[PDB]
Amino acid sequence: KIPISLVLRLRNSKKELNDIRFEFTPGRDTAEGVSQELISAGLVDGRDLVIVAANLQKIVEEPQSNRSVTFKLASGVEGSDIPDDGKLIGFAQLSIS
Amino acid sequence: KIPISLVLRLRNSKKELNDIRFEFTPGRDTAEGVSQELISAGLVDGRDLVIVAANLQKIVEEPQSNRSVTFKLASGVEGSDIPDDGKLIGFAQLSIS
Ligand SMILES: [Ca+2]
Ligand SMILES: [Mg+2]
Ligand SMILES: [Mg+2]
Ligand code: NA
Numbered sequence: 001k002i003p004i005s006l007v008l009r010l011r012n013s014k015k016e017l018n019d020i021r022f023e024f025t026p027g028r029d030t031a032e033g034v035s036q037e038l039i040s041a042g043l044v045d046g047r048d049l050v051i052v053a054a055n056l057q058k059i060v061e062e063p064q065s066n067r068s069v070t071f072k073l074a075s076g077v078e079g080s081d082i083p084d085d086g087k088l089i090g091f092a093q094l095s096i097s
Numbered sequence: 098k099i100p101i102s103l104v105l106r107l108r109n110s111k112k113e114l115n116d117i118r119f120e121f122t123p124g125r126d127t128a129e130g131v132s133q134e135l136i137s138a139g140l141v142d143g144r145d146l147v148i149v150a151a152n153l154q155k156i157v158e159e160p161q162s163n164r165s166v167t168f169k170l171a172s173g174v175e176g177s178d179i180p181d182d183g184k185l186i187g188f189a190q191l192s193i194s
């Protein structure tokens with residue numbers, strides 16, 4: 001169908017926050033496939049494969065209704081940073097562009 | 098039991114953002130009942146009961162993992178306004194406090 005324009009906001013190894021812009025085409029892409037692409041590109045931690053896919057699936061099922069989600073990262077449980085959803089420390093935000 | 102503490106962010110007719118704070122106790126409260134409380138208080142449009150309750154239910158199922166959601170309102174927009182998810186015009190934001 002028509003590609004969905006997405007923004008994944010999360011912090012890298014330098015703890016810098018970045019807007020990762022990518023697209024998802026229903027019927028062509030899969031949530032877990034796109035999540036792996038992001039990991040292979042070094043943009044997402046591999047430990048977050050399942051969680052990022054799960055939340056990507058939530059947004060693409062009904063994108064006119066569900067515009068953004070903020071969710072805990074598995075990789076953040078294993079870091080020393082104190083988790084803080086409001087500043088995306090140990091959490092990520094996935095939104096329609 | 099320790100209630101879940103939540104905040105619903107809505108923009109009023111003067112284009113002002115308001116944060117509505119409320120609580121949800123699992124095993125006691127229901128998503129529909131707490132949503133109707135917000136409506137009875139005059140804080141949420143009755144037209145939005147179903148969508149707000151549905152999103153409340155989703156966030157209280159795993160509140161440690163799912164921290165915020167931005168979703169379309171059924172009460173819609175009026176005047177010269179067009180829906181705008183970034184500005185929460187015709188959309189609402191529900192978060193763990
Ligand atoms: Ca927008
Ligand atoms: Mg693609
Ligand atoms: Mg009361
Ligand atoms: Na917090």
Ligand code: NA
Nearest residue numbers: 176177178179
């Ligand atoms: Na206007």
